[PDB]
């Protein structure tokens, strides 16, 4: 029940998917939902006009609690890393600031040669 008021959020946005996990100032989780975790799948999802109906899903599981204000992490680029933040503030939310927490090597490991389509 605690009623936080100063907890955080984490928007992990891969290309073919994007999750919204609401956690607390420290780091402990709180509530969540996500793209494929809502009706549309395949690649019908990913588009921003899907990954904020998710956003407004976390709202109904993060209001059982008390959040008078929050901040956000955008670990991950892609199709739902702005639009996600849009149906945020509006659906009845404050916000100190935004902080980016996306990967950044100093050239440390090799990456997937992968897609050689």
């Amino acid at each position: 029940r605690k009623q936080v008021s100063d907890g955080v959020a984490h928007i992990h946005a891969s290309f073919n998917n994007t999750i919204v996990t609401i956690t607390d100032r420290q780091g402990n989780a709180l509530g969540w939902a996500t793209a494929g975790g809502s009706g549309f799948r395949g690649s019908r999802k990913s588009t921003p006009f899907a990954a904020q109906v998710a956003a407004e899903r976390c709202a109904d599981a993060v209001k059982e609690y008390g959040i008078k204000n929050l901040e956000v992490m955008v670990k991950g680029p892609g199709p739902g890393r702005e639009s996600t933040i849009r149906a945020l503030n509006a659906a009845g939310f404050r916000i100190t600031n935004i902080t980016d927490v996306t990967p950044i090597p100093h050239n440390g490991c090799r990456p997937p040669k992968k897609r050689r389509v």
Partner: protein, 51 residues
């Protein structure tokens, strides 16, 4: 990448850090590195850059 302000007015200014990284140093890392292609990308896609 630090924002935050006073006077609640969901401003903007998240773009100020849009041009010191972002997908920028992600395209470089995304799939693979370059290896020899930089042997011909900074020293070859440079013919792109002479005027």
């Amino acid at each position: 990448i630090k924002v935050r302000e006073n006077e609640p007015f969901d401003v903007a200014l998240r773009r100020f850090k849009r041009s010191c990284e972002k997908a920028g140093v992600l395209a470089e890392v995304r799939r693979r590195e370059f290896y020899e292609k930089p042997t011909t990308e900074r020293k070859r896609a440079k013919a792109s850059a002479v005027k």
